[PDB]
Design a protein around this ligand. Structure first.
Ligand SMILES: CCCCCCCCCCCCCCCCCC(=O)OC[C@H](CO[C@@H]1O[C@H](CO[C@H]2O[C@H](CO)[C@H](O)[C@H](O)[C@H]2O)[C@H](O)[C@H](O)[C@H]1O)OC(=O)CCCCCCCCCCCCCCCCC
Ligand code: CLA
Ligand code: CLA
Ligand code: CLA
Ligand SMILES: CCCCCCCCCCCCCCCCCC(=O)OC[C@H](CO[C@@H]1O[C@H](CO)[C@H](O)[C@H](O)[C@H]1O)OC(=O)CCCCCCCCCCCCCCCCC
Ligand SMILES: CCCCCCCCCCCCCCCC(=O)OC[C@H](COP(=O)(O)OC[C@@H](O)CO)OC(=O)CCCCCCCCCCCCCCC
Ligand SMILES: CCCCCCCCCCCCCCCC(=O)OC[C@H](COP(=O)(O)OC[C@@H](O)CO)OC(=O)CCCCCCCCCCCCCCC
Ligand SMILES: CC1=C(/C=C/C(C)=C/C=C/C(C)=C/C=C/C=C(C)/C=C/C=C(C)/C=C/C2=C(C)C[C@@H](O)CC2(C)C)C(C)(C)CCC1
Ligand SMILES: CC1=C(/C=C/C(C)=C/C=C/C(C)=C/C=C/C=C(C)/C=C/C=C(C)/C=C/C2=C(C)CCCC2(C)C)C(C)(C)CCC1
Ligand SMILES: CC1=C(/C=C/C(C)=C/C=C/C(C)=C/C=C/C=C(C)/C=C/C=C(C)/C=C/C2=C(C)CCCC2(C)C)C(C)(C)CCC1
Ligand SMILES: CCCCCCCCCCCCO[C@@H]1O[C@H](CO)[C@@H](O[C@H]2O[C@H](CO)[C@@H](O)[C@H](O)[C@H]2O)[C@H](O)[C@H]1O
Ligand SMILES: CCCCCCCS[C@@H]1O[C@H](CO)[C@@H](O)[C@H](O)[C@H]1O
Ligand SMILES: CCCCCCCS[C@@H]1O[C@H](CO)[C@@H](O)[C@H](O)[C@H]1O
Ligand SMILES: CCCCCCCS[C@@H]1O[C@H](CO)[C@@H](O)[C@H](O)[C@H]1O
Ligand SMILES: [Ca+2]
Ligand SMILES: [Ca+2]
Ligand SMILES: [Fe+2]
Ligand SMILES: [Mg+2]
Lengths: 60, 65, 34, 34, 40, 80, 342, 34, 505, 36, 30, 37, 34, 37, 30
């Protein structure tokens, strides 16, 4: 939600199968396309929900 | 098949497979008992449900003891 | 995470017991004369 | 209650009218079944 | 003694018996008037 | 095949059907209308008229709270 | 021989437009009264005295908001018979007390028994196996668990579903907020069976319609079928190859395929019924204890599971005063949970 | 040739007769004002 | 070959191996009972029937032994808190041992009946085919069930030759095993009258003996023999399953609502006792009588038994649990140690205030305090910026009467608020949360778990009834419909009566 | 009898449905249930 | 341990997909 | 001993193996979270 | 006693995995044509 | 595919089942104490 | 849980003894 309040989605970060998710990209991004190469680093890309966009656009 | 002492004693109790009384037999008597039983179940249900409330019958823990 | 310590054995046997049952039945079907 | 008579009257006047246009064939269907 | 709800119980019991009795009396009567035809 | 009854298409295209039902159908419709317009429906089923949900001063709902004297409780709620 | 019972059996089983049968003696009065009771209540009957709600066309509701609502919580699980100790034979009072709810629920239950008996009876007369009756056990399991067992486990019929469109939607949201019912694996299996059943319905219908043999000259292909024909009307072989190459697996046995189409939705509904029996006792899948321990100790730990509980807490606090009027809840503004601004 | 009153006839009217009555009732309701 | 879901059908025509399989099933169930009792005895803490009774400890079979009169251990304790009792052989341990030995003997008998399956007894003497005369078997078994039912009621339950049954006062304070005389009037059908349980078994037993003799001596009518397929053992399976799901719904119901056979000292209180404030009313009645007798407030509340206060606490409500919150209730709120006493809240004007209690529906609940008329006087706010009723603004204090905290008053708002949060659960207790590493989340009791399993099993057995009834009545088409099914038998118009070729038009 | 063509029966019956359902939608905006 | 368990079950399902597709019983026309 | 004529062979074909293992593994993937709690 | 929490699953799989292997082999030997 | 001629049936007779189960169960009875430790 | 484990394994061994003796492959002269 772009309010610097990160939601843990992955199994290794304390989720089970029922609670885990791949979390949407940040509200600060809005509808902007956010590919890996627009981030300063993978660490940044992950904080901001980059994986979600890669997944849903390739999936669709 | 194997005969045994106990099997021979019990043999008459397992010898009338398929035997029937003619026609409807005691079916009318059976239906009367089924109807009485339906009414009995309806009575005990409605007592437990407090739909049927009887003198001296307090359906609660706090009746007595 | 403070998970239930019996969750692991519960899940393991939940998988293994019926899976093994089916594998036993499958293999002895294959070995029957064709 | 006048309100009940008021509501019933059209229904009764309808069933009375339908029996007057079917009694020639309803008595015939009844006697036909013997 | 016969409480109000036991009187109500008897009313419901009699009402159900009347409904079932009338239903079967009518069905039996109709089944007797309009029998199926079978060949010899 | 079929089951012996007269076909519905036969019935509803016949003059006699419409002689009968040009009366019975409007009569039933008018009877239902009057069931409401006379106000009888309110009293049969106990449904409040628009001016009868609340008394003028209180604004509390007449909820039934007593299983076996509920009938007398709605009656007390109705006298208000 | 040929006595009155057999003469009655003859008449009951006549081939007529609407088959009757012995089962019809139970089915037709109970189905008619359950339906007639619903139309009567939704057209004319209030919920003012049981719920504080208007619920009929007469009061101004529309098709989406009318209902036959449950009795007041103070009625407990009373059968609420018209001649019973609550209404005491007063038809008007009976309606105001919610008597039409138990009337519909109970005539509905016995009607459903009659319908499944009808399924058995007709199958036996026509000479088919009674799999349709067996599949109908899933509707019965749902009706009995949701409309009878669930309220019987709770405080009263009040918490059963009310018979109406919006009333049922409220039931769904009550189950989310109070039971966290979406978290329950028996509901999840229900969802899988319903959505999987709908998937099978669509994919099988489409596959048959798109592997048809050309059995006529028309571009509209429905006429090129004869019910008495011996031949399959579509190619199982072509359908099997298509799905094998598209999806990786395909049906090859038509009998298994059609059994599976029954098995999937029937089993899903049965699983959802088991979960509701649990919820009758508040035996919920409400929480994950390990999540709660971590979140209580670590105020930076957040998952979609903790997010949904916050939504449940709002549902409970904001809906309970009006949804549970017998509780006389007064929640001052300052205690209501809410986020910023909203 | 055809019977007029059948089981079908009864089943039709147990539904049709109240439906028309109800539709007249609901029609009248559209003119009620608070 | 047979698919996996039909392997047991090899028993249908093999009465001897069916008996063997039934013996093995019986051995497994008896062995479960023995093992379950031993596991419970190895884990049960008998030292406190007041605040740590069996139903707080997840005990499932222990209450069933106690209900029928097994109340003592060979180690010297009894479930009513006695010491130095001699139970004889029929202690909890003796019952477990007996079930284990029974299991082994049934297992051995199963082996014999499996090997020696081809007994002449199981052959029809005329045809030489396997045959069971199920109508006469029913009479024999019904006669035996009637005798046992009658004897259970006439000798065991009465104490005439046996121990009696568990009975208690209306508040579950003084329960014990007692002889119970039968109740032959209408109150015998009151589910809360134990004398009706005694009368039931005497009267139903006698009826069972008579009906059994009828069923031994009178053959079924031909019309019923054919209609119910009385030559097909699967008809018995169908109707037996029906009777069993009926019984299972009944025991689920009487467990959930309570009856003379589901007493609260054995299975825990019911949810309805919380809904109706059953224990709170009796507590308040007793306190008011003490006060009217001149007692001080401290004396009046100190006269309340800890056991009565503990029932007036939502952690013992069976509708507060979770499907996957496993184990004993003690694993949630902890092992109860002592009543803290009755908390009385007051504001700075000295008006007594009452905490609104949590209904069972709510996993969480706000803290709201009202005066005696239900007017809100204090609460714990969420948003603070427009708070009017905070404990700080209203000067809320809490004083305790009875229990550990008797005579104490707290004024520090966080402490007062802490106690108010416990008061939404009813009476306030001190818990040991360390011994079991309790997690603070409510679990249900054996009353709840029993009800859940038996309602679920009953509903599933409805499917089994439908399935086997179908297989019984449609056996001729189980492999499919007649390949040359007359199209006139399913089309319309050909037969006057559906499925009757003799009614061809 | 076939004196009244089925397509006329269908057309008139259908128009009747439209009229009465139309009345019910009118009633959503006037009188009870209109929010006004 | 719980993460290993979840990923293990998932991995078994994916392996099952592979065998169910490429090592299925071949459909044979008769 | 003389042979029991009621014995029958049992079968599970490969498709049934795959369907059953799928059911078991998916049920385990579903229920395991609640077992760990 | 404070035993190792993996001891239960270790023992269970130690028993189950090789025992099941042998049961599979035995049953499919019995089912072979004689 | 053309059939692989190197395949062979596999056998485990009942005595070998009993010997193997005895080995496994006794090894488990022996080692379980050290696994629980 | 450890006592249950030890007693369970022991019980399985005793059961195996029973089957190994009374349900052995019968020795047959050929
Ligand atoms: C399969 C598919 C086949 C299709 C079947 C469809 C046909 C259905 C027809 C059956 C109708 C059943 C109605 C049951 C009504 C009921 O139960 O009504 C409930 C009454 C009990 O009454 C309740 O009792 C409660 C507890 O009171 C007790 O405790 C209180 C607090 O201490 C007070 O002391 C009080 O005096 C004392 O009586 C509260 O008072 C409630 O208000 C009151 O409603 O029991 C009773 O009538 C009877 C209870 C025992 C028999 C129950 C058998 C049937 C129900 C099985 C399901 C149970 C599910 C449980 C949850 C899981
Ligand atoms: C035919 C199928 C059928 C079935 C299965 C039901 C079933 C039911 N009805 Mg419905 N009903 C029906 C048709 C049916 N009805 C019809 C045709 C009408 C229109 C008249 C109604 C109108 C109706 C109303 C107005 C009400 C019900 C109600 C009920 C419920 C309570 C019934 C009861 O307690 O009876 C008890 C009676 C019996 C079970 C009869 C059994 C008779 C036994 C076998 C023989 C005994 C005879 C007796 C000894 C004779 C002497 C009596 C003497 C002691 C006075 C039950 C769900 C009540 C309800 O739903 O409340 C919520 C209710 O208020 N019904
Ligand atoms: C009617 C049966 C029954 C009931 C009501 C009880 C009740 C109780 N048991 Mg007992 N027990 C039983 C049978 C039962 N037990 C059996 C058969 C055994 C041998 C395994 C035991 C061994 C046992 C032990 C060792 C312990 C208990 C304990 C307890 C207490 C806590 C229960 C708990 O946490 O459950 C939790 C229940 C669940 C989590 C629900 C499981 C639901 C399953 C997994 C659903 C499966 C779905 C299925 C796979 C889907 C199929 C789909 C397909 C058809 C398509 C409670 C009093 C505990 C206690 O406190 O003892 C003092 C305890 O330690 N029990
Ligand atoms: C008295 C109870 C009872 C008895 C004796 C039977 C007996 C039978 N059933 Mg029926 N059935 C019952 C209740 C019963 N059933 C119930 C309650 C249901 C609904 C769940 C059914 C639904 C049913 C179906 C759909 C079918 C049968 C079939 C059969 C026949 C073969 C069963 C078989 O080979 O399984 C072999 C089973 C296995 C190899 C493994 C099953 C493992 C289960 C699913 C999980 C483990 C359960 C656990 C061990 C149970 C503990 C006890 C429980 C009460 C808690 C056999 C005559 C079959 C039939 O008609 O064949 C012609 C068949 O298709 N039954
Ligand atoms: C001759 C044929 C006999 C057939 C008998 C059939 C019996 C069963 C029929 C069931 C009908 C149930 C719907 C009734 C709706 C109604 O009357 O609304 C009547 C309401 C009345 O309109 C309301 O009247 C009030 C009067 O105070 C207020 O004015 C409200 O504001 C106004 O909304 O009309 C509507 O809501 C408009 C929509 C109409 C309903 C559309 C339903 C579509 C969904 C149906 C799904 C089930 C399938 C049924 C198939 C048949
Ligand atoms: C509901 C299904 C809706 C979709 C199907 C619509 C078919 C529409 C269709 O295909 O029309 C075709 C068909 C043509 O009718 P006919 O004029 O040929 O008349 C046929 C008769 O002569 C047959 O004996 O219409 C009908 O027969 C049925 C018309 C409705 C009759 C309804 C009578 C209802 C009475 C009560 C029924 C209760 C049954 C309860 C069972 C448990
Ligand atoms: C309602 C009709 C919906 C029909 C099309 C949607 C279902 C497709 C399912 C998957 C393929 C299933 C499939 O393969 O269908 C096959 C089926 C039969 O194919 P035929 O080749 O015999 O006929 C189609 C053409 O070839 C013309 O003869 O197609 C139809 O029956 C079309 C019916 C048109 C009915 C009149 C037009 C209605 C169009 C409405 C579409 C939805 C609009 C919603 C409201 C705006
Ligand atoms: C035969 C058969 C079956 C079994 C049938 C069985 C077991 C039938 C047994 C039926 C029994 C025990 C029926 C008992 C009925 C007793 C009744 C109806 C008692 C009524 C008493 C009343 C109304 C008393 C009223 C009063 C009260 C309460 C207060 C007093 O002050 C005033 C008074 C006397 C009016 C199966 C299982 C269904 C299988 C198929 C075939
Ligand atoms: C309850 C009760 C009873 C019963 C009654 C009855 C039986 C009734 C019935 C009633 C009825 C029987 C009614 C009906 C109604 C109907 C209606 C009201 C309809 C409407 C419709 C519409 C509105 C339509 C719509 C639509 C659709 C659906 C789709 C297509 C399109 C349209 C839109 C057109 C008695 C007396 C026994 C007892 C007491 C209680
Ligand atoms: C031989 C012998 C002997 C011995 C014996 C013994 C030692 C026995 C034991 C036995 C036992 C020891 C048994 C046990 C059993 C058990 C069981 C049978 C169980 C079952 C279980 C189940 C079935 C479960 C289920 C489930 C689950 C798991 C989960 C949850 C859900 C449910 C519940 C479903 C003697 C010495 C006497 C001598 C003679 C000979
Ligand atoms: C978690 C525990 C996991 C343990 C897993 C253990 C897996 C064990 C796999 C056993 C492999 C057996 O493999 C099986 O061998 C038999 C012969 O013995 C083959 O059987 C083949 O030879 C026999 C000769 O008698 C013929 O009757 C049969 O028609 C033929 O197909 C099967 O086609 C094959 O499937
Ligand atoms: C309606 C419930 C079913 C009850 C069936 C009992 C049938 S009763 C049956 O009726 C015949 C009439 O001719 C007699 O000949 C015969 O002797 C009599 O027993
Ligand atoms: C298999 C071991 C058997 C051990 C037998 C010990 C018998 S002990 C004996 O048992 C009776 C039971 O009612 C008691 O009444 C009696 O007082 C007691 O001494
Ligand atoms: C500020 C803390 C006030 C001290 C008393 C708090 C209420 S009471 C408190 O409640 C705990 C559960 O929360 C129990 O575990 C514990 O035994 C009990 O002392
Ligand atoms: Ca005005
Ligand atoms: Ca701790
Ligand atoms: Fe199909
Ligand atoms: Mg309007």
């Amino acid at each position: 939600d772009g309010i610097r309040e990160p939601v843990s989605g992955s199994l290794l970060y304390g989720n089970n199968i029922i609670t885990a998710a791949v979390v949407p990209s940040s509200n600060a991004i809005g509808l902007h396309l956010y590919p890996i190469w627009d981030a300063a680093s993978l660490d940044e890309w992950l904080y901001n929900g980059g994986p979600y966009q890669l997944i849903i656009f390739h999936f669709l | 098949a194997r005969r045994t002492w106990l099997g021979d004693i019990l043999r008459p109790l397992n010898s009338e497979y398929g035997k029937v009384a003619p026609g409807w037999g005691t079916t009318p008597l059976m239906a009367v008992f089924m109807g009485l039983f339906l009414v009995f179940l309806l009575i005990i249900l409605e007592i437990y449900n407090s739909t049927l409330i009887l003198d001296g019958v307090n359906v609660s823990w706090k009746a007595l003891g | 995470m403070e998970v239930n310590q019996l969750g692991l054995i519960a899940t393991a046997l939940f998988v293994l017991v019926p899976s093994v049952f089916l594998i036993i039945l499958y293999v002895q079907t294959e070995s029957q004369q064709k | 209650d006048w309100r009940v008579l008021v509501v019933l009257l059209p229904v009764l006047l309808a069933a009375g009218w339908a029996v007057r246009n079917i009694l020639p064939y309803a008595v015939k269907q009844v006697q036909k079944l013997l | 003694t016969i409480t109000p709800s036991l009187k109500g119980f008897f009313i419901g019991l009699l009402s159900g018996a009347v409904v079932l009795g009338l239903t079967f009396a009518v069905l039996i009567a109709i089944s007797q008037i309009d029998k199926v035809q079978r060949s010899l | 095949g079929t089951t012996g009854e007269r076909p519905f298409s036969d019935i509803i295209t016949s003059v006699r059907y419409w002689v009968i039902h040009s009366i019975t159908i409007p009569a039933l419709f008018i009877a239902g209308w009057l069931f409401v317009s006379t106000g009888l429906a309110y009293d049969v089923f106990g449904t409040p008229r628009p001016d009868s949900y609340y008394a003028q001063e209180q604004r509390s709902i007449p909820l039934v709270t007593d299983r076996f004297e509920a009938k007398q409780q709605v009656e007390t709620f109705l006298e208000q | 021989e040929r006595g009155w019972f057999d003469i009655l059996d003859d008449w009951l089983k006549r081939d007529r437009f609407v088959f009757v049968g012995w089962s019809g003696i139970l089915l037709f009065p109970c189905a008619y009264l359950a339906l007639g009771g619903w139309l009567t209540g939704t057209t004319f009957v209030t919920s003012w005295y049981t719920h504080g709600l208007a619920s009929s066309y007469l009061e101004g509701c529309n098709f989406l908001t009318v209902a036959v609502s449950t009795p007041a919580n103070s009625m407990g699980h009373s059968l609420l018979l018209l001649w019973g100790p609550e209404a005491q034979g007063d038809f008007t009072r009976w309606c105001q007390l919610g008597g039409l709810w138990t009337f519909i629920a109970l005539h509905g239950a016995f009607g459903l028994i009659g319908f499944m008996l009808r399924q058995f009876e007709i199958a036996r007369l026509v000479g088919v196996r009674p799999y349709n009756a067996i599949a109908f056990s899933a509707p019965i399991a749902v009706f009995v668990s949701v409309f009878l067992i669930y309220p019987l486990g709770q405080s009263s019929w009040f918490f059963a579903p009310s018979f109406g469109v919006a009333a049922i939607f409220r039931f769904l949201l009550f189950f989310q907020g109070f039971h966290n019912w979406t978290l329950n694996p028996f509901h999840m299996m229900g969802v899988a069976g319903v959505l999987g059943g709908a998937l099978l319905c669509a994919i099988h219908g489409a596959t048959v319609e798109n592997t048809l043999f050309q059995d006529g000259e028309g571009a509209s292909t429905f006429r090129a079928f004869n019910p008495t024909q011996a031949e399959e009307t579509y190619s199982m072989v072509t359908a099997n190859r298509f799905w094998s190459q598209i999806f990786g697996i395909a049906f090859s046995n038509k009998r298994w395929l059609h059994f599976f189409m029954l098995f999937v939705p029937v089993t899903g509904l049965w699983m959802s019924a088991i979960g509701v029996v649990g919820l009758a006792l508040n035996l919920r899948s409400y929480d994950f204890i390990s999540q709660e321990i971590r979140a209580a100790e670590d105020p930076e730990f957040e998952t979609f599971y903790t997010k949904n509980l916050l939504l449940n807490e709002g549902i409970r606090a904001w809906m309970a005063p009006q949804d549970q009027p017998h509780e006389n809840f007064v929640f001052p503004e300052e205690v209501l949970p809410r986020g910023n601004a909203l | 040739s055809y019977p007029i009153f059948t089981v079908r006839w009864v089943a039709v009217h147990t539904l049709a007769v109240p439906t028309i009555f109800f539709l007249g009732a609901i029609a009248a309701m559209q003119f009620i004002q608070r | 070959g047979l698919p996996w879901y039909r392997v047991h059908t090899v028993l249908i025509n093999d009465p001897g191996r069916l008996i063997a399989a039934h013996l093995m099933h019986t051995a497994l169930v008896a062995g479960w009972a023995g093992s379950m009792a031993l596991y419970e005895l190895a884990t049960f803490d008998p030292s406190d029937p007041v605040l740590n009774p069996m139903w707080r400890q997840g005990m499932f079979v222990l209450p069933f032994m106690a209900r029928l009169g097994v109340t003592g251990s060979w180690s010297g304790w009894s479930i009513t808190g006695e010491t130095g009792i001699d139970p004889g052989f029929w202690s909890f341990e003796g019952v477990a041992l007996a079930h284990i030995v029974l299991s082994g003997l049934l297992f051995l008998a199963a082996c014999w009946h499996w090997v020696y399956w081809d007994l002449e007894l199981f052959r029809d003497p005329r045809t030489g085919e396997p045959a069971l005369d199920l109508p006469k078997m029913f009479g024999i078994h019904l006669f035996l069930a009637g005798l046992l039912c009658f004897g259970f009621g006439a000798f065991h339950l009465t104490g005439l030759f046996g121990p009696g049954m568990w009975v208690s006062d209306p508040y579950g304070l003084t329960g014990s095993v007692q002889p119970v005389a039968p109740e032959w009037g209408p109150d015998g059908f009151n589910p809360y009258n134990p004398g009706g349980v005694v009368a039931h078994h005497i009267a139903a037993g006698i009826v069972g003996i008579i009906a059994g003799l009828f069923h031994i001596l009178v053959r079924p009518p031909q019309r019923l023999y054919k209609a119910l397929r009385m030559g097909n053992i699967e008809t018995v399976l169908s109707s037996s399953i029906a009777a069993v799901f009926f019984a299972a719904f009944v025991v689920a119901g009487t467990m959930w609502y309570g009856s003379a056979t589901t007493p609260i000292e054995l299975f825990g209180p019911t949810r309805y006792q919380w809904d109706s404030s059953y224990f709170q009313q009796e507590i308040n009645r007793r306190v008011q009588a003490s006060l009217a007798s001149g007692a001080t407030l401290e004396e009046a509340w100190s006269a309340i038994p800890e056991k009565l206060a503990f029932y007036d606490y939502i952690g013992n409500n069976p509708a507060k649990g979770g499907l996957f919150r496993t184990g004993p209730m003690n694993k949630g709120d902890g092992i109860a140690q002592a009543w803290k006493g009755h908390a009385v809240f007051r504001n700075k004007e000295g008006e007594e205030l009452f905490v609104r209690r949590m209904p069972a529906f709510f996993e969480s609940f706000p803290v709201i305090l009202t005066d005696k008329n239900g007017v809100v006087k204090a609460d714990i706010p969420f948003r603070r910026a427009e708070s009017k009723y905070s404990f700080e603004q209203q000067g809320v204090t809490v004083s305790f009467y009875g229990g550990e905290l008797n005579g104490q008053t707290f004024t520090d708002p966080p402490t007062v608020k802490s106690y108010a949060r416990k008061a939404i659960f009813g009476e306030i207790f001190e818990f040991d949360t360390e011994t079991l590493n309790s997690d603070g989340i409510f679990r249900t009791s054996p009353r709840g778990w029993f009800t859940f399993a038996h309602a679920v099993f009953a509903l599933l057995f409805f499917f089994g009834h439908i399935w086997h009834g179908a297989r019984t009545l449609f056996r001729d088409v189980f492999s499919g419909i007649d390949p040359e099914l007359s199209p006139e038998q399913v089309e319309w118009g050909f037969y006057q009566k559906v499925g009757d070729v003799t009614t061809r038009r | 009898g076939g004196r009244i063509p089925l397509w006329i029966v269908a057309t008139v019956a259908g128009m009747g449905v439209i009229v009465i359902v139309g009345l019910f939608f009118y009633g959503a905006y006037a009188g009870l249930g209109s929010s006004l | 341990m719980e993460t290993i368990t979840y990923v293990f079950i998932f991995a078994c399902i994916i392996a099952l997909f592979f065998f169910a597709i490429f090592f299925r019983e071949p459909p044979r026309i008769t | 001993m003389e042979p029991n004529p009621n014995r029958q062979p049992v079968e599970l074909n490969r498709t049934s193996l795959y369907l059953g293992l799928l059911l078991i593994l998916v049920l385990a993937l579903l229920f395991s979270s609640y077992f760990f709690n």
